[PDB]
Design a protein around this ligand. Structure first.
Ligand code: 5HU
Ligand code: 5HU
Lengths: 143, 143
């Protein structure tokens, strides 16, 4: 193995607008580790949980979060679950990268933007076309 | 002294439910001090144009209040990264937590919030707008 465990977060029931970007992010993360949460980018997944109970979703996810070496979150779409994941991840002292798209026209949550602290919690603005180059930079410097 | 109460509600995730946040915060004052009462301000927008100095100040002040809180109450109908983040940090602090969700919104509540419920220290209650005060009364007779 020897692969870093990568834990990806992205809105599901908060909205699936950014699913194609999640796919691109997951695809590139695979270059630098094993993505525990590839399901978040699945095209079939809907925003009404139509594809086990939520308790199982929560418990399995928290198990993966505690395995993770790095947490990567696309935080452009407001999502309770993505925020919740990042909260638990901070409490676990996980290394965290958050990716936000200003082109969305939104202003990113101050609880995420304001959580940026040192190298362990970073928040990067990006345009859709540079997502792979930014993930390379991030993981080439801090694998 | 008086219980310290920590209310969570979407700001930059959208202010659609602001009137309900005002009703929740107002009723919560019957049971203690609402540390995060600013979340209910009617004039508050979703773009952070009201505060200067950066989001780091908001994150740090909030976490200070969260650590002071005796009870956490979150209205989780509007998807919000910040509300989710607050609940994640609060779960890590093992805070007593009540979330209130409105199924009449047409949304399906995040599995990370719904699935975080253990029926005791983390409770998630469905409600309709008219009864929010009655439910807060029902929760704080015991809390
Ligand atoms: O079915 C699910 N499976 C799942 O793993 N999640 C996790 C992974 C995502 O990063 C995050 C999305 O939360 P939300 O659905 O509130 O937008 O929660 C969320 C859901 C539905 O909330
Ligand atoms: O200016 C702010 N002040 C503030 O206290 N918050 C906290 C309290 C709210 O319960 C929660 C709302 O998060 P959000 O803005 O991402 O929807 O975060 C959030 C913001 C803006 O994100």
């Amino acid at each position: 193995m020897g692969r870093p465990a990568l834990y990806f977060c992205g809105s599901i029931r908060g909205g699936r607008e950014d699913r194609t970007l999640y796919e691109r992010i997951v695809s590139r993360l695979r270059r630098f580790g094993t993505v525990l949460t590839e399901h978040v980018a699945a095209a079939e997944l809907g925003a009404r949980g139509e594809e086990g109970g939520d308790r199982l979703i929560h418990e399995q996810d928290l198990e993966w979060l505690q395995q993770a070496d790095v947490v990567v979150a696309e935080v452009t779409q407001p999502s309770l679950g993505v925020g919740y994941q990042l909260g638990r991840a901070v409490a676990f002292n996980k290394r965290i990268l958050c990716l936000f798209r200003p082109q969305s026209g939104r202003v990113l949550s101050a609880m995420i933007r304001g959580a940026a602290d040192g190298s362990r919690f970073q928040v990067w603005d990006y345009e859709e076309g540079e997502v792979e180059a930014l993930l390379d930079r991030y993981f080439e410097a801090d694998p």
